[PDB]
């Protein structure tokens, strides 16, 4: 029986990217113009994109146009779709469809489906960081911990930029949530933890959020 | 090209002939196929270039017309035959399809029973609270839940999912479950899931009270 | 300039698949073998991939042969990485390079490449379910909440098979978090609520895990 | 299979300097050999290929030279923007091997790290997640160890650690390792422990506190 198999599907933020791809079993694909389709939550489906004989025309959907790139592989028997910019409403079971029929002719329905596979992508493009306090315990060393924000970069300056000696700012780590985390700090005279005030300043232009924390001794 | 289906939900009995139609904003000859599709399955082809039926697929199903006016026919529902339809005009590089058609089982009108559960002490010392609202064997399928906490609307923060219809009673149940931090959900007192439905000649609200 | 640019890259699991792509800018791919490089977390880079003019052969290091794919697009100058049953290992940012030179000759350096995407394999490839209650407060309901698993399926049984009337288990739903979650429930006379123990089986056949539960009131 | 190995791993020296890298084939590869420059997270630069050739645009101060086996990579003059990774690469005609790379950075005294570790926040610590940091300031050369323990329980699995650049003003390194833990796992046990070493340390450094003190 002819097979066909989507893979790459998963969980995709607003904006970024996800490629999947098609493979068959007991048919080639080079004679057939090959398709992606989505089955949207509401239950219905939507053509997404064709690639005919020899990659000659490649359509796609007013919806993805602009976004989504459909290619394919004859030799080695794959189709593949690059979306890009995504949107919520791109939510949905992605099917890779053969067009053809027992006898082929220039116009034929998709006699055969992959089993889909699961595409969602999540509302928010970006995700502001929490900041707290590294409280500090001759020389003392406090920061901020700026905690669970995307995509990146966030900036931190401390005391507005009049303190520079002595930061380190490290760069971030992805965390196993899939957001990013970063520490700044500083090392100061200990005799200045009762009198100085030390504020860390945090920018995240992606989600047009700035922090101003004040670490003090807890 | 637009493709209008009707009806949106069928509902009938094991045996009947049922029509579902589609039509086209402009003419399309008779480029056009129908598929079955099984929740969580593929696409099947039934019939194609209007009236053509694919090797294998049952007799009983059939379709007919041109231009811009198409029919589906089921002469004989057999309990395999509840499941979405949809159409599809395709051309030669390009397609679109119907909005499908979901073809259900008919029984009278049931409204749901409803039950809030709150979170379970152990999942509340693990740090989240899962508040889980039941909907049970209602009919029709189409139900609304809102949660309300502290008589404040929640949005994005739920999610449902719905069983197929029972194969006793034609019946379907939802469960939806809110989910909230530890901290959060002990931010607020009173827990309340309200449900609207075809059997109900206004809304229900099951509450409880934090603690 | 000539220019590349890797899109595709994420968070995957052990086991899963990512397929990323490359397309480029200034130059068309056609005549050059295209290549894939990864940078692993100890700072060497390793070669992946590469695939010849035409297709002639797709090559690959010994590390992911038969499991990865390389595909080439030479009409609109894509390539293409598969990226099947992940390790923990494959774990690095992957880059596109083009052999290639000032002057194409028999043998090339990799004279350009795109800046590289990032790609992170998390070691747990599955992960069993947490289990509670769902308490009864005519007929009364209770159940059990299936939470934070993967991947499909769950199975769940009331009393080892024995209450089947009344019984609903619901779909999965994929959380934000991508661990998947569903509720099981029945409705029984409130007279059994003293007598009667009720006890959901739950069982995870990717993770081996079996959890037995009893829901009695509060 | 060529096999390439580059020496030294690590290579240390003043701004003006001339350095060589050494870069050495398992068999011989004649001269199908090519250098590459690249910076922490930006893309690699090719240098030199064919062992000799200098890329159109690539500044004189670099060369290479060797055929066979034994290769080498020559800057005379270090400049501030050479301080990188210098990677050498066989490339035949349908795979490539890299060597493991050659980290040049600029050279100091030995710094032994001065350790520093800081609780969760309360603020933190009331959503539900408990990040406690340990901090290794100031240090040289970048090789360290930071291991955890709770409850005099060496951990595993539960960190993350990222490491700066060499400092613009001092030349040093410095280091945060993150141990995360929910809010109940927490306020389970009492005792935070980060235990480090490091070559400039004659023994472990331990930094510790007790949870509320
Ligand atoms: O999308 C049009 C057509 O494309 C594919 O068939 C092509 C070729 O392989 C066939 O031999 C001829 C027959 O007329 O048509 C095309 O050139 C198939 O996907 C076909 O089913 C489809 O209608
Ligand atoms: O692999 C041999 C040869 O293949 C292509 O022509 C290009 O990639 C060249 O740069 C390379 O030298």
Redesign the interface.
């Known amino acids: 029986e002819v097979q066909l198999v989507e893979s790459g599907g998963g969980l995709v933020k607003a904006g970024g990217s996800l490629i999947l791809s098609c493979g068959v079993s007991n048919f080639r694909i080079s004679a057939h113009t090959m398709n992606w389709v989505r089955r949207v939550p509401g239950g219905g489906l939507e053509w997404v994109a064709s690639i005919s004989t020899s990659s000659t025309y490649r359509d796609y959907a007013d919806a993805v146009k602009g976004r989504f790139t459909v290619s394919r592989d004859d030799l080695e028997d794959f189709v593949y779709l690059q979306m890009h910019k995504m949107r919520v409403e791109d939510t949905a079971i992605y099917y890779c469809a053969r067009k053809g029929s027992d006898r082929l002719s220039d116009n034929d329905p998709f006699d055969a489906w992959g089993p889909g596979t699961v595409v969602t992508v999540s509302p928010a493009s970006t995700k502001g960081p929490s900041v707290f306090p590294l409280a500090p315990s001759g020389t003392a060393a406090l920061g901020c911990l700026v905690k669970d924000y995307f995509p990146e970069p966030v900036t931190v300056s401390w005391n507005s930029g009049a303190l520079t000696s002595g930061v380190h700012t490290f760069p971030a780590v992805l965390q196993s949530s899939g957001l990013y985390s970063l520490s700044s700090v500083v090392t100061v005279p200990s005799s200045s933890l009762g009198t100085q005030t030390y504020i860390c300043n945090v920018n995240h232009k992606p989600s047009n959020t700035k922090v101003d924390k004040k670490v003090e001794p807890k | 090209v637009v493709m209008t289906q009707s009806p949106s939900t069928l509902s009938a009995s094991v045996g009947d002939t049922i029509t579902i139609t589609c039509r086209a904003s402009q003419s399309i000859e008779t ?1 056009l ?1 129908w ?1 079955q ?1 099984k929740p969580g ?5 039934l019939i ?1 270039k209007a009236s053509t039926l ?2 294998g697929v049952p007799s009983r199903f059939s379709g007919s017309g041109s231009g811009t006016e198409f029919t589906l026919t089921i002469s004989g529902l057999q309990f395999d035959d509840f499941a ?1 339809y ?1 159409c ?1 005009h ?11 058609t ?1 073809v259900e089982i008919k029984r009278t009108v049931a409204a749901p ?1 409803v ?6 002490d ?2 509340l ?3 989240t609270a ?1 508040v ?1 609202c ?1 909907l ?1 064997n209602f009919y029709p399928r189409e139900a609304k839940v809102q949660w309300k906490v502290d008589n404040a609307l929640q949005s ?1 923060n739920s ?5 197929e219809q029972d194969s006793k009673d034609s019946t379907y ?1 939802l ?1 939806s ?1 809110l ?1 909230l ?3 959060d959900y002990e931010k607020h007192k009173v827990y309340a899931c309200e449900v609207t439905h075809q059997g109900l000649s206004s809304p229900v609200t099951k509450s ?1 009270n934090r603690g």
Not at chain 2, 41 to 45: E, F, G, R
Not at chain 2, 115 to 120: A, Q, R, V
């Open positions: 480029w196929a598929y599709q399955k593929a696409p099947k082809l194609y694919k090797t979405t949809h599809q395709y051309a030669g590089y390009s397609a679109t399809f119907g909005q499908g979901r029973s039950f809030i559960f709150p979170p379970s152990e999942q010392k693990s740090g899962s889980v039941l049970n994005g999610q449902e999912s719905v069983t149940s469960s479950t989910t931090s530890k901290a409880f």
